[PDB]
Amino acid sequence: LDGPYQPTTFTPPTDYWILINSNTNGVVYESTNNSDFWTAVIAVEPHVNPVDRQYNVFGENKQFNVRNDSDKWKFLEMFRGSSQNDFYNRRTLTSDTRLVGILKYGGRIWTFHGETPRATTDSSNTANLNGISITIHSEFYIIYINNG
């Protein structure tokens, strides 16, 4: 509906889906409150063998082992709950549409995971929702995931 907006960093308001039109094979967005919430979504092109790729995430070079044996894009959610904790692949969205969504609502971050056209929403808790800001690397909309 509203957009597209160009890649930027901002603090999302609550109750609005951010829909990111992923158009490359790297970091799609980085989201943190710098206390209890770090999420980076990495885009993996169809049909790649296991590779150890370097990403610049929150000003640190991180190596992630990624793979994709499918015809679809893989959007890996990498999560850590503190600056000291290791990132881990918390969720994966497997998508032909290349749309990634995030919502702030009810003290939670909501995203889509699983495989289009039956991707479902899931929640992450935070003690500081209001402090979560996001750097979006692709054009985005503010309000589909499964359908385009």
Ligand SMILES: CC(=O)N[C@H]1[C@H](O[C@@H]2[C@@H](O)[C@H](O)O[C@H](CO)[C@@H]2O)O[C@H](CO)[C@@H](O[C@@H]2O[C@@H](C)[C@@H](O)[C@@H](O)[C@@H]2O)[C@@H]1O[C@@H]1O[C@H](CO)[C@H](O)[C@H](O)[C@H]1O[C@@H]1O[C@@H](C)[C@@H](O)[C@@H](O)[C@@H]1O
């Ligand atoms: C159940 C469920 O939802 N399982 C999905 C899993 O984590 C759950 C999350 O809700 C939460 O983060 O953690 C919980 C643990 O306390 C739950 O286990 O998340 C993974 C990662 O996204 C899902 O797997 C991904 O999606 C599937 C489709 C596949 O592409 C995986 O390779 C990919 O990692 C996981 O979904 C289940 O995965 C298994 C096989 O490993 C089956 O495919 C299963 O069909 C699939 O469940 C289906 O997709 C879910 C996203 C959801 O729509 C569920 O209702 C549906 O049955």
